[PDB]
Ligand binder design. Structure first.
Ligand SMILES: [Zn+2]
Ligand SMILES: [Zn+2]
Length: 85
């Protein structure tokens, strides 16, 4: 036979997932907060979204699943770590 080749260095960046990103602003979640519906949003977004769209009853609605979640009961999604067992 007869053939040859050389070295090649070509990598790719992280594939911006269109699932984790904020379903509202579609940008890096800044100090987001998880919700009952395992849905987190920009500390601000979540706040505004609620104000703009709220239920006369008192609670609001998720801009993704539209589920009634108790405001304030939001956990910080900043310490997103697991391997730290
Ligand atoms: Zn946002
Ligand atoms: Zn949701």
């Amino acid at each position: 036979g007869s053939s040859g080749s050389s070295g090649m260095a070509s990598s790719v960046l992280e594939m911006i997932k269109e699932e984790v990103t904020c379903p509202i602003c579609l940008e890096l979640l800044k100090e987001p907060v998880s919700a009952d519906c395992n849905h987190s949003f920009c500390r601000a977004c979540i706040t505004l979204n609620y104000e703009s769209n709220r239920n006369t009853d008192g609670k609001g609605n998720c801009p993704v699943c539209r589920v009634p979640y108790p405001f304030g009961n939001l956990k910080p999604n900043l310490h997103v770590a697991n391997i730290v067992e």
